[PDB]
Amino acid sequence: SGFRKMAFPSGKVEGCMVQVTCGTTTLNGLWLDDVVYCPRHVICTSEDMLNPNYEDLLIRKSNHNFLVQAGNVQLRVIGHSMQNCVLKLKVDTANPKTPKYKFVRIQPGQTFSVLACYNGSPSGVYQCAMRPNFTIKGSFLNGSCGSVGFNIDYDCVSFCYMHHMELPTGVHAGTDLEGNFYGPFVDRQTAQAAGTDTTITVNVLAWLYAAVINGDRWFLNRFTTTLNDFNLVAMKYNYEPLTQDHVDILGPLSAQTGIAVLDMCASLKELLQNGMNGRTILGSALLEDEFTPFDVVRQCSGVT
Amino acid sequence: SGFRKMAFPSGKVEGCMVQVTCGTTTLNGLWLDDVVYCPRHVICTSEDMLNPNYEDLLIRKSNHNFLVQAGNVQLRVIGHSMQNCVLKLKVDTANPKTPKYKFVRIQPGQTFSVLACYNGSPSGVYQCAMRPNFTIKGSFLNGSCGSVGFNIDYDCVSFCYMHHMELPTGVHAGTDLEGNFYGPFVDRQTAQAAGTDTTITVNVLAWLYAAVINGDRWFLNRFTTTLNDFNLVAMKYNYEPLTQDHVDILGPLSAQTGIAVLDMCASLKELLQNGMNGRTILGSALLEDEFTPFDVVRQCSGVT
Ligand SMILES: O=C(Cc1cccc(Cl)c1)Nc1cnccc1-c1ccccc1
Ligand SMILES: O=C(Cc1cccc(Cl)c1)Nc1cnccc1-c1ccccc1
């Protein structure tokens, strides 16, 4: 028993982190096979970050201007290209530590682990979620750009996120491994709007099931509700509308506990309308939404 | 910016996890050099866990009864010994992936990362703290025994914890890598008392400094207090007494922010006496105590 914000083991991803230097800018790159992936803003100086013409800036750059380092060994760059907001640096050596991998664009509400890096060196791993407003609330400092977010399936790493930007609001924005930003964000030093961040209702419910499994049952009540009635409460509290797909996804948790999804929805409804009254659920005083039903099942069944 | 419960990258520790089987019991072992370390309760059946005579049970065991597997390769066992509550299995092969390591017994209030494992295979990494009552609040299922807790210093892994037991209260107990339990716990299936768990005051204060650094300043007030007056409030709320050593340790954080330790103590005092009033600090509705001043400085400075 016990329930924690758990990240995937990061070893497979640590073996892919390199340092990319262009001009005076140093950031992280992901080395998979003979390609190093990094944010294209590596070619920018502080001056041109206000309105960069990336295609024009890349024209002033050659393969020898991109300094790629893995640990202490310099990688030789034989090709360079821009794919959306990432640069792909072809090197002459395939990463001997390249794990089985996939590039996937995750859906908002889905979770992933981040290996925060500085100068190609990993410093920490944490679990987070792609917010419904396409931002992530991570821990990133200057130099962390190029740090990746991922999931693991047995031996296969599915890279889903590359860190690029911190908004003036202190939240983080980035891209998938094809360089497409999550959300409406652009890699420019301009005032960008994150948008309203709603609560991932299916995740809160999954965490309420995790709580019941791990003994926390105080919030369970003698009530039930309907999808339409729960969703009236959900809209008032900026929670994602719950669909039948969400209910279906919570099926294994409802079967494991014997608590019907709509009865758990009534508990959540009362928690939203009355608060916690000074109590906690899984050592938290707020409703946690960064555990998918898959994460709860996985954590409660020990999937390696 | 941003502040998360961050764990160390786990790659160095993943390369040490093996599976140890004795009789019908399967658990995790830590392979460093030619030694596999695991909880001695691997020799026990469910029957003798009520009152085991480990020395007597170990007498019925030979090197060939200990099945050690690293990935898919069987390790040959040439020696076995019991050191406190751990067994040391001498194998004929030194772990080629053995990192630079140390065995250290951490102090209560200190933090470490746990790589939760099942059948020698890692499943997740999370950050936790040794509670003042010598328990840890982790996420461990059956099969997780032998999972290790550690810290990393540049390239050196300091192993500090080996998981052994879950108490009926749902909390976790274990040993250092010399097999000495943290706390008064014994590796027996008996009713064991965790003891009163107090809040690590120096860690809450360090997290309040992390909050100020990361923009959350609402809790800062026009007041100050003394060690003796803050400690009167601390005793009432089951918080560890704050000593001058704790104040000294918070020095770099006090210098970084310009907020005197005793002024931060007055903010904490008001937070304890009045609560959060529905507000949050670093996305939490309760005072967080599992970030040491070292963890705050590290996270806010990007130590790799
Ligand atoms: O925000 C940026 C640089 C940037 C700016 C505009 C557009 C882009 Cl694509 C990138 N990167 C960071 C990443 N994560 C966390 C913090 C920072 C950061 C660095 C320096 C000072 C303040 C914050
Ligand atoms: O509690 C034990 C076994 C045990 C019992 C008495 C003494 C010792 Cl040294 C070890 N291990 C577990 C470790 N972490 C989490 C959960 C469990 C667990 C396993 C089976 C059923 C319920 C809980």
XYZ file of C-alpha atoms and ligand atoms in Angstrom, chain A residues 41 49 140-142 144-145 163-166 172 187-189, chain B residues 1, ligand 1:
39
model
C 16.069 28.345 -30.137
C 14.577 35.999 -29.337
C 12.864 23.946 -14.899
C 15.617 26.525 -14.644
C 17.744 28.245 -17.337
C 16.883 22.965 -18.779
C 15.643 23.452 -22.373
C 10.982 21.475 -22.880
C 11.348 24.824 -24.590
C 9.867 27.704 -22.688
C 8.798 29.145 -19.396
C 6.076 25.574 -18.866
C 9.165 30.003 -29.411
C 9.394 33.816 -29.150
C 10.111 36.123 -26.199
C 10.976 28.329 -11.822
O 11.996 30.763 -21.041
C 13.055 30.243 -21.381
C 13.857 30.762 -22.558
C 12.975 31.075 -23.746
C 12.377 32.322 -23.881
C 11.463 32.566 -24.894
C 11.144 31.568 -25.802
C 11.778 30.346 -25.690
Cl 11.468 29.113 -26.881
C 12.680 30.085 -24.678
N 13.547 29.124 -20.815
C 13.474 28.541 -19.528
C 12.978 27.246 -19.480
N 12.456 26.699 -18.381
C 12.471 27.427 -17.261
C 12.982 28.706 -17.180
C 13.490 29.294 -18.338
C 14.067 30.661 -18.217
C 15.328 30.956 -18.736
C 15.940 32.169 -18.461
C 15.300 33.110 -17.677
C 14.042 32.842 -17.171
C 13.425 31.631 -17.442
